[PDB]
Amino acid sequence: DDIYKAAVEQLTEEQKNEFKAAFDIFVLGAEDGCISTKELGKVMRMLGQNPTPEELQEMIDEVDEDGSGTVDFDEFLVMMVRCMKDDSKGKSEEELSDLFRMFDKNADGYIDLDELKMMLQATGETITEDDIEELMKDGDKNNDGRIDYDEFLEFMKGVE
Amino acid sequence: GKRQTEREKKKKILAERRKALAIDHLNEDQLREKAKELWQSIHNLEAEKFDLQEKFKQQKYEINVLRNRINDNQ
Amino acid sequence: TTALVCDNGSGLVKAGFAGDDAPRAVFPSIVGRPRHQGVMVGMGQKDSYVGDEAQSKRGILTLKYPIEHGIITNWDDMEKIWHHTFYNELRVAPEEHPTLLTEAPLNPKANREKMTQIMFETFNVPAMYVAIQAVLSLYASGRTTGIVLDSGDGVTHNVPIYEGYALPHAIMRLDLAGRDLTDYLMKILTERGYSFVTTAEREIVRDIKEKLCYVALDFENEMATAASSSSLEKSYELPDGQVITIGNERFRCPETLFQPSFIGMESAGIHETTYNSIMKCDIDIRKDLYANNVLSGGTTMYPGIADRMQKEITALAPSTMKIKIIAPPERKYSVWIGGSILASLSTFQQMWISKQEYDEAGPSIVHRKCF
Amino acid sequence: TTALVCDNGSGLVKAGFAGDDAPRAVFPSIVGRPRHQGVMVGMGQKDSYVGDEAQSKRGILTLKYPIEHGIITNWDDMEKIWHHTFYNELRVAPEEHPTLLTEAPLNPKANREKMTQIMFETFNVPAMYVAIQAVLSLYASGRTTGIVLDSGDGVTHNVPIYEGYALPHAIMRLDLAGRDLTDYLMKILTERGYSFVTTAEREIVRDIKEKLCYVALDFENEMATAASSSSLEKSYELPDGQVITIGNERFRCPETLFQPSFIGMESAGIHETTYNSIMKCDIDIRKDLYANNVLSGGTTMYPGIADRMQKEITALAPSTMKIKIIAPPERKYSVWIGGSILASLSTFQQMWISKQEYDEAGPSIVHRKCF
Amino acid sequence: ISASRKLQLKTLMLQIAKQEMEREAEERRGEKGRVLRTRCQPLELDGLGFEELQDLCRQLHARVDKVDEERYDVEAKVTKNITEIADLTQKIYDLRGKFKRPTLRRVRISADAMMQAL
Ligand SMILES: Nc1ncnc2c1ncn2[C@@H]1O[C@H](COP(=O)(O)OP(=O)(O)O)[C@@H](O)[C@H]1O
Ligand SMILES: Nc1ncnc2c1ncn2[C@@H]1O[C@H](COP(=O)(O)OP(=O)(O)O)[C@@H](O)[C@H]1O
Ligand SMILES: [Mg+2]
Ligand SMILES: [Mg+2]
């Protein structure tokens, strides 16, 4: 999603200075050979300002998900995006509204549970303990089984 | 809401949009060109109005979900 | 298309499409302008909250009913109430739906004519018809005879009907109703220390009346019992705490119906105006009216009224006749159910006041053949 | 352009551009002329040090606040303070910036009119607007209802608001505030031997009050405990050494808020004027005010006040209502944050008192529609 | 119940939703294109007296004006729905802005960083 655009916009002025200065300060080498392939934590330490942890965790996991374990120029941009606020910031709430509109193209007065059933079916994600639990919990945010608009509205928001 | 006024605005627009055409002030082929111009302009108008109906349907979506939320608040 | 069965009433507006069992939207008929100044900017504060919205913001409003006693005293507010009812509680434009209003008997003509003029000019309905509030309540019971006592919130009227032929000379309309009982309850609560004055606190007193008051089977015995024991004192929690205890105010508030001398009214109670309305009828249909006495309207929902009224009438009536009081559980919406039934009839489909007819004869068409 | 959200206050002037999170420059509002003779020539000695400069040379000055209790008693000094605030702490000429002053409720008119006249004639701003100090503190909490107790340093006032409609008949303004607590602390410190008299040493007593004093959850138990053990005696180092030990003076200084009889004031504490302010409101909005009690102002920063006040109100209030006390961590600057939010609104952009309007109606424009 | 599983699940379903939104958008695009195509009423432009030409284009003008009038009325209707949506948005923003109204502001400028200059 917004990941590639955030990487592209990293070509800027404030984050360019941030990346260059970070490299000049605490990316130098001349170690004992421990291979700081995990210098992500070192950079988090040497930042002087830690951003919200979601950036850190998404970078820790999703980067080199194949197990590359290495940070490139583009991955330097990824880490620096993690440093500044290059986030999509919850995407567009217009997109959330449009999605919920497509959900109630049947116009159930709310996104029905079977909307979620078919959407998970399309996504094909394995039905774990998280699956079905999340759907019922969002629908039964009243804990009464009635799915309302604001329930899934806040369920989907805050995410990119 | 005072339909005489709103219909009056509509009539003002239409008479304004009554771009009546003259006789020896256009060419036969030029008249064809103007006809196609109206054709395409109204086609775009129809597309915009269809999207307008779509967004109105989405407005009705918001109306029903909103009033249902309101009832749930009681 | 379907017809809109609106029922203005006085205290609760009940509306819904013809052919159902219950009204779709029921909400108090009050329009309350804010009275304080207001300091928050951009809060989106409107100039008048109508319907059920003004029963939640009633702490800073001055609610005022637009219908006093059947008649309508404030036409702008009534127009606002109708506009709300059509557009927000039913969401059906009136340009495509016939309407069936209801009106109390013996009301001023100008009220009815203005009602039809509004419905035809402002809302621009296809056709509207005005019906007497008691004939509908007789429809809902599935009868065709009987004398119906429709004790609403504005006005109590008692229309006798036989074999479908209404008796216009025997209608006894009395202006004591639920609102006067609310005021009298609010006035006798002051004997314990609780003072309700604001027009918003009238709603609290109304809730007390609905939830606690009941009609005593025998008044003197209850007055004696409540003055010795304490088995009657029921408590109730105000909207902020400070529970209150109602003693013998419980059955003294609705007793005003059978003794209108309590609020200074001269006339006789609802137990004796029914007997008088019967005795004005012919001598050969009195047995049927005795056997088919019908109750309707909201105020006849007090627990224990269908027995007190029967006891009183049996005391008044000759000993041989059988006195039976029909009190269906769906009393409150009886008028509207009857209205739905009447609007759903095929034989009635040509009685509407069509718009072209109004254009030819003016608003005075309602008094003409299309009644 | 951007608006200047100034906030005169009494004790700390807080200012900054609209749309930020915290005031740009916060400094005490004191103007102190030197009092000794002065023998060094050419030292560049000025005739009056204002703001934070006079808190460093306070050893040879006579500091005097220009605002006593909300009202302004010395207009020349206040003009000097404003001039300093605009030119040296923000460095923005006022000719190109709207201003949003703040004023306590129930203040004399002449104070407000003189304030607007100064802002329009001397500093020559484009447009200025005066707002009540409690509505802003309600803005900052993100609420729209609630009763806010804004216990500043000059005056403590308690403005209840519901749904954006302020209730002008329920404002309870009390003149006990941080300054009287400083004087009372300075008066009870003499019971151990420490005498502070000079107007410069009032600042030292203020620092003692800020750093050591706390509000006791239960007064008698604390008085008994401090009189037996010695676990409360906290020491503090004066600006020259000679540490002092504060015993049960710690929770006796801020206790004056809940028992104004200590400093001889008749009125009831801040725990009971809030309940009285609520009870003057209508009967249907008391639950919401109970649930959304807001604290603001500097003096409400004592450690342990949000529990003492809740305990007291729960004792006074009916047992069913839920009592909740909103005490945001950014209490001190709550009024200014609210002021920034209000000045940043688009709907508010046409409420400013434009200069041409002042030229047409004189300084009395402030009491008019542009409030 | 694991946070990682929840993140994976919501991410996958949200991307499915985004893809279906793009599909809905392009399907609407095709609908509108076909709709305009079938709206067109072609005319036999040749072999007519030029006066017939002017008359025919005038008929087109009349139909065009009436069509734009229908679009006007529906635009007004959706505008009223917009006003109602604004009212309901005001309602919900009232109920939630009682707690989150001033969230619109400008923060984090100079006090946070410029600190040792004084
Ligand atoms: N359950 C109840 N018990 C006692 N009184 C009631 C009850 N419900 C309604 N009422 C009284 O009846 C009134 C409503 O009467 P209603 O039939 O709605 O009048 P209208 O004929 O105008 O519709 C209320 O004002 C209330 O005082
Ligand atoms: N952390 C604190 N603890 C206790 N009291 C404080 C604290 N900070 C400020 N005060 C008191 O509050 C006063 C400042 O209040 P303030 O809110 O600045 O008043 P104003 O409303 O005039 O701005 C100071 O005089 C001080 O006595
Ligand atoms: Mg009725
Ligand atoms: Mg203050």
Side-chain angles (χ1 to χ4, degrees), chain D residues 33-68:
Chain D
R33 294 87 160 81
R35 76 185 189 196
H36 290 117
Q37 293 177 335
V39 295
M40 292 295 183
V41 70
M43 293 301 293
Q45 304 141 346
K46 299 192 299 176
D47 296 334
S48 68
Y49 310 81
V50 318
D52 215 336
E53 184 176 8
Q55 277 284 108
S56 170
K57 298 186 173 185
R58 76 184 176 218
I60 43 92
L61 303 169
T62 155
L63 320 175
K64 296 182 181 180
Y65 294 72
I67 293 194
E68 278 296 322

Side-chain angles (χ1 to χ4, degrees), chain D residues 14 133 150 152 335:
Chain D
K14 295 158 289 179
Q133 284 199 0
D150 180 87
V335 168

Side-chain angles (χ1 to χ4, degrees), chain D residues 66-78:
Chain D
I67 293 194
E68 278 296 322
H69 294 151
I71 87 183
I72 307 182
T73 62
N74 190 3
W75 276 111
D76 177 60
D77 293 356
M78 187 88 272

Side-chain angles (χ1 to χ4, degrees), chain D residues 312-329:
Chain D
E312 295 289 358
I313 295 185
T314 304
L316 298 175
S319 306
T320 305
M321 301 296 104
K322 183 178 179 180
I323 309 298
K324 179 69 68 64
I325 292 193
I326 280 80

Side-chain angles (χ1 to χ4, degrees), chain D residues 84-151:
Chain D
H84 171 85
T85 305
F86 289 162
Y87 287 79
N88 303 20
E89 289 288 349
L90 302 187
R91 309 187 190 88
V92 283
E95 300 280 4
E96 305 181 354
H97 281 285
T99 321
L100 177 69
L101 293 324
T102 62
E103 180 78 3
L106 299 191
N107 261 9
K109 316 293 275 300
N111 161 40
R112 168 182 301 181
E113 300 169 355
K114 280 285 304 179
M115 173 184 305
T116 204
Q117 163 182 327
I118 288 301
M119 292 302 294
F120 269 154
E121 287 193 359
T122 293
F123 298 89
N124 216 318
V125 293
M128 52 87 61
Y129 183 66
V130 178
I132 304 307
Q133 284 199 0
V135 179
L136 283 324
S137 59
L138 196 48
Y139 269 114
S141 297
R143 315 268 176 189
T144 179
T145 82
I147 159 184
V148 24
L149 172 119
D150 180 87
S151 172

